[PDB]
Amino acid sequence: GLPWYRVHTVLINDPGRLIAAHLMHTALVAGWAGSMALYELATFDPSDPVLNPMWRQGMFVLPFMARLGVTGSWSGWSITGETGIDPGFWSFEGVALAHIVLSGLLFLAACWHWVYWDLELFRDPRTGEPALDLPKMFGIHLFLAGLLCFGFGAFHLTGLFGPGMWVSDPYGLTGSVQPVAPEWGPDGFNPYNPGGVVAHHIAAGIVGIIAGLFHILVRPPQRLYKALRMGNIETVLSSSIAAVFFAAFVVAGTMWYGSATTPIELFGPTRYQWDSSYFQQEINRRVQASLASGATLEEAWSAIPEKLAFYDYIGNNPAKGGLFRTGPMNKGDGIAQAWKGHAVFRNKEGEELFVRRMPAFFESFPVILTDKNGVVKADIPFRRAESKYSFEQQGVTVSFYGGELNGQTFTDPPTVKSYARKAIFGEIFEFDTETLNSDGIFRTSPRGWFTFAHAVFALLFFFGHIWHGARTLFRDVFSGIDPELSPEQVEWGFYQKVGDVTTR
Amino acid sequence: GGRIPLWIVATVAGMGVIVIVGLFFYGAYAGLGSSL
Amino acid sequence: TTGERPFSDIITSVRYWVIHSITIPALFIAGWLFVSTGLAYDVFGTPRPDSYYAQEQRSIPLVTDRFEAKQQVETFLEQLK
Amino acid sequence: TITPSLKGFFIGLLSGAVVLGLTFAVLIAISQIDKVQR
Amino acid sequence: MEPNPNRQPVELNRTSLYLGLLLILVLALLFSSYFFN
Amino acid sequence: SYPIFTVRWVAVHTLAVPTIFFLGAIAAMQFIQR
Amino acid sequence: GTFNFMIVFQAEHNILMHPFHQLGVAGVFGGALFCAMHGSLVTSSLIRETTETESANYGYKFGQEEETYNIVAAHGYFGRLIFQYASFNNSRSLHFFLAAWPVVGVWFAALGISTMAFNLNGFNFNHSVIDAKGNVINTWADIINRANLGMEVMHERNAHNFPLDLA
Amino acid sequence: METITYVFIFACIIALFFFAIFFREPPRIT
Amino acid sequence: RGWFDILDDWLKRDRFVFVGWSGILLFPCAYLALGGWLTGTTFVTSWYTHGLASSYLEGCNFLTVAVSTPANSMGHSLLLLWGPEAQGDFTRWCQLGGLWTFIALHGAFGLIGFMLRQFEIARLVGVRPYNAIAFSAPIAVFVSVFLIYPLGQSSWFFAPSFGVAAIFRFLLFFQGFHNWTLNPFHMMGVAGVLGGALLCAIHGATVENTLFQDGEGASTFRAFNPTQAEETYSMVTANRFWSQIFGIAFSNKRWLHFFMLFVPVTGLWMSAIGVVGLALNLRSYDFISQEIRAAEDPEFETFYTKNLLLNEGIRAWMAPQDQPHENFVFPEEVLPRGNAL
Amino acid sequence: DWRVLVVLLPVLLAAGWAVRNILPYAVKQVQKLL
Amino acid sequence: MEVNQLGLIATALFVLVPSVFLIILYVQTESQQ
Amino acid sequence: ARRTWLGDILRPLNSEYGKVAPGWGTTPLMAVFMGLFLVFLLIILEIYNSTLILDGVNVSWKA
Ligand code: CLA
Ligand code: CLA
Ligand code: CLA
Ligand code: CLA
Ligand SMILES: CC1=C(/C=C/C(C)=C/C=C/C(C)=C/C=C/C=C(C)/C=C/C=C(C)/C=C/C2=C(C)CCCC2(C)C)C(C)(C)CCC1
Ligand SMILES: CC1=C(/C=C/C(C)=C/C=C/C(C)=C/C=C/C=C(C)/C=C/C=C(C)/C=C/C2=C(C)CCCC2(C)C)C(C)(C)CCC1
Ligand SMILES: CC1=C(/C=C/C(C)=C/C=C/C(C)=C/C=C/C=C(C)/C=C/C=C(C)/C=C/C2=C(C)CCCC2(C)C)C(C)(C)CCC1
Ligand SMILES: CCCCCCCCCCCCO[C@@H]1O[C@H](CO)[C@@H](O[C@H]2O[C@H](CO)[C@@H](O)[C@H](O)[C@H]2O)[C@H](O)[C@H]1O
Ligand SMILES: [Mg+2]
């Protein structure tokens, strides 16, 4: 009979059982989303949105709920840390419950559609064969897609009837769910402008309504009907797999590069913020503005928020993980407890040195300290015998400003070296390694895991597209070429046009 | 059609290839890229 | 068997070798002159052996600025004088 | 206003239209002249 | 209610069993080190 | 009785023409000194 | 342990820059290419003996006398994919080529290792490109040498007592 | 546990070799 | 008989090089990617992007020429000739690495054009499209390595440069930075490639040595005729031979030839998935349990631990010259070295 | 620039030489083509 | 060695789940007429 | 086959299977919209890529 890899092909000419299979799939996916949400809620520690946010805790679905406006728990906390909001029904638990209930209702519907497969609706009224008018089903679905796209943009995202979306300042310090007005200028196409997302959904929604109406009312050209095999449901599968892999590559890219739909308070910082020292530059700017106003060095650095310093730390970079390094980012370095403050390194001549920071490519990196002109002044040498730049030789000390160790200074070279080795990671934090039995090895964020899964899925879906497209266009030779294939079709010198018997 | 024998064409073209590649091997030891 | 003239009939014909005993050396010589006039350096921007470094320079003219890279190269080239 | 990269964008858009346009005029023209014998 | 005429028998021959088991066991042997980590 | 100019003729000369030019250029490079 | 052998070998012999290894690579990439090509062309030209609900492999019976694929169709495809004289129409020639390509390539790979056994190494172009003054102009071979140096200085890190790694 | 797991999977593979060789579907000329 | 149908007639004419509708995409894109590569390796430097000589014009040979990637400061810029970086200046475009993106983008669209050609010809002659399906693997490799890998990284600079030794640098970069040999997806790739070459060698040799005597010559190639209906070699003898030598043997010629598609194609797909992971630095760099043990027990040594030291040497000794945008100054005393060497 | 002419000198001068040795037969091909 | 606590169950199910799938399909094939 | 209430309501929407417009139909109009969509995608690609730089459009978080 059927080989194992073709068992589902019994649905190809059975629309009621195809609907049943699709309902069972939707039941499973909705059930996944509810169960995942509930596992996250069981595991999530909401007590510290500053050094232990959701992206340090391995939270995958919780940022997706928060992005569209689900802020609170029925247990009384919210993701921003604000004390004493009540979310109503649509808390994180209420969303999860709504998915489980939906999963069960789709399950029952799948049972019904499986049993009652033989519906008159699925039959051609002329031939009596199972038939789906695929072009008109497209227009109906496209119209419905367009209504929902429009209503989501016009009502949910704008806040006209709905919560809005998560929006934040450029440094990820004060993000919240806010209503967003559409941006109708050219800045609507800036991926960092949330008003563009609103305006897209209004415009694309209307265009979907208009195109859906066209596809309801206008039949396909005969040329395209033949060329695209529009009586074959496999042609839709081929083209749908293609649109889907396109969309997966886009969401993979916008997750990795950042956009207004992938904000850093929900997903963590990007690797490009570490690459460009994005938060280091903002930290130094605020410090120099404070020092230009007459603050001391302690006063300047003590004003830098712990949240901002925590983004300037390589263990929050999503390109520092490993494929088999499993679990939350907290499982690597620990649960971050406090900023130790900014370490300033000086040699015995009083000149400030700067630790060269680790690039993301490097599993390990040497400790090298330069002046402000990038001349090497101190290091932690490998071979000690001819070393000239050692911390003992250059009299390297370290002082801390702001944070836990504010106003402290250290001089003994073992202690100064251990801080220098941490300074290659950017800002220095105290970490609780004991709670999770943290191993000390960096893990990637949900931004990294999402990008990995979606790029991998998109690449595989390209194969599915090629495979199902080939099955569609070559359906007549699927079980083999015609046993009376004419050698004149395939030998040179007979037909003027390749495979055209009339050109003989 | 069949003026010049194809073996003569093959031989002269084959030897033209040898001379050109042999020049490139000569240039590995002289001038640029020779390390001298 | 696609109707074109066979290659072994063409390259053994004298008309081919009337034509190609002129066109083949002329192309080869045109390539030779593209290098030996120095035009190849000016079309592509490839350094001559005396234009990698300024006379006492040891550093590489690396491009560091995306939207002013065209000017960084021009400033590197104007320092070759 | 039209930025230089926008004018540069319109240059590439026009240059692609000219490449595809002149390719398709030539392909159509040769096809019209060298039809298949049916 | 009349039975569904789209139903088809499914087969897996013995060589396919041996090939699949080989595949699953070798993937297990390959990935096990990474799962233990 | 055969044609001279074909799609084949064009494909041959799009490769063979720059090839001979590039072989002359690279030959001349063998006689560049530093 | 295999990977350690490979990395140290590259450090000490520059195997990547040895043409015998390069022929080995052509042997194995080409072999996998030709494996894919021959598999795909035969599978594409299978003659219909089965329906859609069964594996096309049941179209062949063990020890049947007839050919199970149309080699004229496969030649007609692949000779239009490239050009006619690029494609085998003789199955005996085709299968000889499938034998000879990876086998000759792997022979060169084996001879590569076995001749680097006597320290005749891959091409050394370190500092081959010199400017008019005499400055070294790095090439990609010079970047390979840095990587080679890093493996060399680190491998068997306690075994060497003298400056040159001689065997 | 690790060592037992690796040896177990290995031992199953050797067993599968035994069945694939001595209890194959016999090639039949038809 | 509209203009479309006459153009379709001309494109699908039996000629020496079949054109097709796919040939409109394939033939210019392939010619430019090929021609861009030869042009760049003959005449174009990498002095301003990498600090390297990379052309025959500068003294390199076939092993060392490359069209090198653009500078890291370019990011993932398309680097169009008319773009904001070159501003229409062809000479500057070559100096900034615009030929790399030119080759990569035209190579990409040519590869699409080539798979479209495979579909088009298979449809016209009436064969199944398995050759196009098998070509998905080299496409998956090209896309993952040449596009997705640098897109995950900081810039196109870290993609492979189109050159022999440049590729060798890419191989050694992936050992030293990614520990790519340890990655189970690469291992699956190796198995598919080596298993593919094995099947190529063994199937060719098996056919050649079970041939039927179909003629009188001792050179046996003449005894084949493409219009024969009969098998040219004995499947039964081949089966008996391999069953007695190796224990198992093929007995279905169709499954044999499918398996030959499947093995190298699956392997290349598996490696592509690994490279996608490496785009995000999601490496299989280390085994956590061995690192815990090696850190606490200075007598525990394995071949895996030795390889990590090799990798540390690669990174330190190569990074200053391989990543000149970073301005690494690694003083001699910080470089990891063993005793003596 | 005097060097573009010098490189285009043998190209132009041999194109014109081949379009002379093929013109009695390039005409006949295009004539029956019409 | 300090290994992942879920590595044993992950390996055991990765073996057992598709292996039993193949065994189910094999056995019911043999029992067909 | 089983008639149902909802099935009889939805019956006209599954009634024109295999029905086509003659010839090329609206193909030239479709091609135009495909061309514009390609241009649209190039524009937004080049904005995200910083190949297309527009006044008022700072492609960065700081915007
Ligand atoms: C004025 C109204 C308006 C506004 C303000 C917007 C705004 C936006 N649109 Mg929308 N749009 C509109 C109307 C509007 N649109 C209308 C009427 C339509 C037709 C229905 C669309 C159709 C549309 C599509 C299809 C897309 C957008 C997208 C966007 C977003 C672009 C920025 C971005 O993140 O792109 C990032 C995406 C790109 C820059 C496109 C990348 C193109 C890829 C690279 C082509 C190659 C794909 C291939 C598979 C790659 C394989 C190789 C790879 C592996 C290396 C932005 C929110 C994009 C989006 O949603 O992004 C999140 C998007 O894909 N719009
Ligand atoms: C898009 C899918 C997706 C993504 C991006 C995430 C992301 C995340 N998950 Mg979630 N999860 C998912 C789906 C996903 N999950 C699903 C479907 C389930 C149900 C099983 C879960 C159940 C789940 C639990 C119980 C937990 C997570 C956790 C996490 C976090 C840690 C990730 C980790 O350690 O993975 C590690 C990733 C790997 C080890 C990669 C596996 C490699 C594959 C399996 C190799 C297979 C090769 C294949 C067989 C080859 C075939 C070859 C053949 C073709 C020839 C991360 C934020 C953890 C967390 O921190 O929560 C707070 C956590 O405890 N997830
Ligand atoms: C929307 C997505 C989609 C849909 C609806 C289909 C549907 C189909 N595929 Mg296609 N295909 C797709 C994507 C899709 N495919 C992709 C992405 C690929 C590349 C991987 C393929 C490659 C492919 C091939 C090579 C073949 C098909 C075939 C088929 C047909 C039979 C399937 C069957 O019986 O398998 C039965 C499958 C099993 C019994 C077990 C498979 C288990 C997998 C390997 C691992 C476990 C998956 C896990 C449970 C769920 C993960 C979901 C994931 C998205 C997160 C059916 C029409 C077959 C066909 O065309 O028949 C004529 C066929 O030969 N597909
Ligand atoms: C099938 C053939 C083909 C394809 C797919 C490509 C594709 C590409 N080329 Mg290549 N090119 C080709 C043939 C091709 N080329 C040929 C034959 C030549 C020699 C003449 C070139 C010479 C060339 C150069 C010198 C460069 C490229 C570049 C590119 C890239 C950017 C192109 C772009 O953005 O234009 C945009 C234009 C379009 C996509 C046209 C689409 C058609 C639209 C939908 C119709 C409407 C347009 C409208 C009428 C225009 C009016 C404008 C008006 C309002 C002012 C892209 C990968 C660039 C590159 O490689 O960067 C690294 C580059 O620098 N090409
Ligand atoms: C009936 C009913 C009910 C109930 C319901 C329920 C209770 C449900 C649930 C459900 C659920 C709860 C479900 C879940 C699901 C899940 C799933 C569906 C999953 C899947 C998974 C997967 C698929 C995975 C895989 C993987 C792995 C493992 C690793 C990595 C890779 C991957 C990712 C692939 C109620 C009362 C309401 C009412 C009505 C009736
Ligand atoms: C055909 C052909 C070809 C080509 C080849 C060639 C190119 C060759 C050449 C050849 C040659 C070109 C040869 C020559 C020879 C020579 C000789 C063999 C000589 C000898 C001599 C002698 C022996 C000497 C002696 C002497 C002395 C000792 C002293 C003094 C006196 C004298 C001088 C007398 C090809 C592959 C393409 C293809 C196939 C065909
Ligand atoms: C990029 C570009 C372009 C294009 C251009 C082209 C398309 C080029 C082409 C070019 C080409 C097309 C070239 C050629 C070259 C060639 C060569 C240079 C050759 C060489 C040869 C030899 C050296 C030989 C040797 C050998 C072999 C290979 C193997 C066997 C043995 C012997 C030894 C014989 C355009 C303007 C559009 C636009 C802008 C940019
Ligand atoms: C934890 C992992 C577990 C995964 C479990 C996997 C379950 C797989 C289910 C396989 C089901 C096969 O399903 C079974 O197919 C066979 C044929 O193949 C059908 O059998 C039918 O056909 C056969 C052969 O024509 C007849 O002899 C039989 O009388 C008839 O009923 C069964 O009626 C159906 O129940
Ligand atoms: Mg020289």
Dihedral sign (CA G31, G33, G36, G42): negative
CA A201, CA A181: separation in Å to the nearest integer? 12
- The rounded distance, in Å, linking the Cα atoms of I139 and I118 is 13
- State how far the Cα of A430 lies from the Cα of A416, in Å rounded to an integer: 16
Helix (H) or strand (E) holding G113: helix G91-116
Q: Which two tokens stand for residue I49?
A: 């992007």
Nearest-angstrom CA–CA distance, I327 and I320: 7
Which residues on neighbouring strands pair with residue A390, listed in sequence order?
A: A379
Range of the domain at I123: 1-341
What are residue A399's DSSP bridge partners? Answer: A344, A409
Q: Is I257 annotated as a binding residue?
A: yes
Q: Give the Cα separation of A146 and A150 in Å (integer).
A: 6
C46: tokens are 């490839």
A93 touches A34 (CB < 8 A): no
- Are I183 and I85 in contact by the 8 Å Cβ rule? The answer is no
Q: How many CA atoms lie within 13 A of A145 on its CB side?
A: 14
Which of C5, C8, C12 to probe the B interface (max B CBs under 10 A)?
C12
Q: Is I228 helix (H, G, I), strand (E, B) or coil?
A: coil
In order, the DSSP letters of A473-496 are HTGGGTT-B-TT--HHHHSTTS-S
End-to-end Cα spacing for chain K: 52
CA distances from G156 to A84, A410, G166, I292 (A): 63, 38, 13, 22
**CA separation for the pair A299, A289 (Å, rounded):** 12
Classify each residue of L6-38 as buried b or exposed e, where b means 16 or more C-beta atoms within 10 Å of its C-beta: ebeeeeeebeebeebbeebbebeeeeeeeeeee
Q: Is G38 annotated as a binding residue?
A: yes
Residue A294 CB coordination number (10 Å): 8
Please list all protein residues whose beta carbon sits less than 5 angstroms from ligand 9, which is an ion. Answer: B 27, 31-33
Q: Judge whether G51 and G59 are in contact, CB under 8 Å.
A: no
The CA-based diameter of chain B, rounded to the nearest angstrom, is 51
What's the gap in Å between the CA of G94 and the closest CA on chain C?
21
The count of CB pairs under 8 A between chains D and J is 3
Map tokens 């033989």 to a residue. Answer: A118
- CA angle I108/I110/I111 to nearest 5° reads 65
Classify strands I162-163 and A165-167 as parallel, antiparallel or unpaired. unpaired
Domain residue spans of chain A:
1-270+444-504, 271-443
> Which technique?
cryo-EM
Q: Output the domain CATH number for residue D10.
A: 1.20.5.510
Cα Rg, chain C, nearest whole Å: 23
Distance (Å, whole) CA A257 – CA A319:
12
Q: Which residue intervals of chain I are DSSP H helices?
A: 3-11, 22-43, 90-95, 98-125, 130-142, 149-152, 164-178, 184-209, 235-246, 253-279, 288-296, 303-322
I48 CB-near residues (< 8 Å, 6+ apart)? C61, C62, C63, C73, C76, I71, I95, I96
Rg (CA), chain L: 23
Of A437, A436, A442, the residue nearest A323 (C-alpha): A442
Q: Are I204 and G35 in contact (CB under 8 A)?
A: no
Ligand 8, pocket-test mutation among E10, E13, E17, E24, most atoms within 8 A of CB = E10
Every domain of chain C and the residues it spans: 7-79
Task: State whether residue A493 sits within 8 Å of chain C by CB.
Answer: yes
Neighbours of A87 (CB within 10 A): 19
Say if residues L41 and A160 touch (Cβ distance below 8 Å).
Answer: no
Tell me the two tokens of residue G80. Answer: 């239009």
> What does chain D come to in residues?
38
Q: Which residues contact I110 (CB under 8 A, 6 or more apart)?
A: I25, I26, I29, I30, I32, I33
**How many domains does chain D contain in total?**
1
Residues of B in contact with C11 (CB under 8 A): 6, 9
CA distance G56 to A79: 57
- Name the minimum distance, in Å, from the CA of E10 to any CA of chain I: 18
Check the CA dihedral A340-A346-A347-A349 and report its sign. negative
Q: Within a 10 A sphere around the Cβ of A481, how many other Cβ atoms?
A: 24
Nearest Cα to Cα of residue A429 among A342, A300, A325: A342
Q: Which helix (H) or strand (E) holds A82?
A: none
Q: What is the CATH number of domain C7-79?
A: 1.20.5.860
d(CA A410, CA C42): 58
Structural element, H or E, at residue A238: helix A233-257
- Answer whether G61's CB lies under 8 Å from I289's CB: no
What type of residue sits at position A90?
W
| DSSP-derived 3-state class of residue E7 | coil
G119 contacts: CB under 8 Å, gap ≥ 6: G13
Residue contact E32–H20, C-beta within 8 A: no
Pairwise CA distance, residues A492 & G72, whole Å: 11
The candidate with the shortest Cα–Cα distance to F3, out of A351, C6, A98, is: C6
**Residues belonging to chain H:** 30
In chain H, the residue whose alpha carbon lies closest to the alpha carbon of I246 is H21
Residues C75-80: contacts with CB under 8 Å, at least 24 apart: C76/I48, C79/C54, C80/C51, C80/C54
Q: Which domain holds residue D13?
A: 1-38
Distance between CA atoms of residues I229 and I64, nearest Å: 51
Number of H helices, E strands in chain B: 1, 0
Q: Tokens 């073209």 map to which residue?
A: B13
For chain I, the domain total comes to 1
If 0-12 CB within 10 Å is exposed, 13-18 middle and 19+ buried, where does residue I274 land? buried
Longest dimension (CA), chain E: 55
Helix ranges restricted to H, H1-30: 2-22
Partner chains of A (3+ C-beta pairs under 8 Å): C, D, E, G, I, K, L
A85 backbone φψ class: left, alpha, beta (φ>0; ψ -120 to 50): beta
Q: Are strands A397-401 and A409-410 parallel, antiparallel or unpaired?
A: antiparallel
* Contacting subunits of E (3+ beta carbon pairs below 8 A): A, H, I, K
| Inter-CA distances, L53 with A80, A181, A349, Å | 35, 23, 47
Give the three-state DSSP class for I213.
coil
Alpha-carbon span A248 to A455, nearest angstrom: 7
CA A475 – CA A481 distance, rounded (Å): 11
What is the DSSP code string of A323-345?
Answer: TT--S-THHHH-EEEEE--EEEE
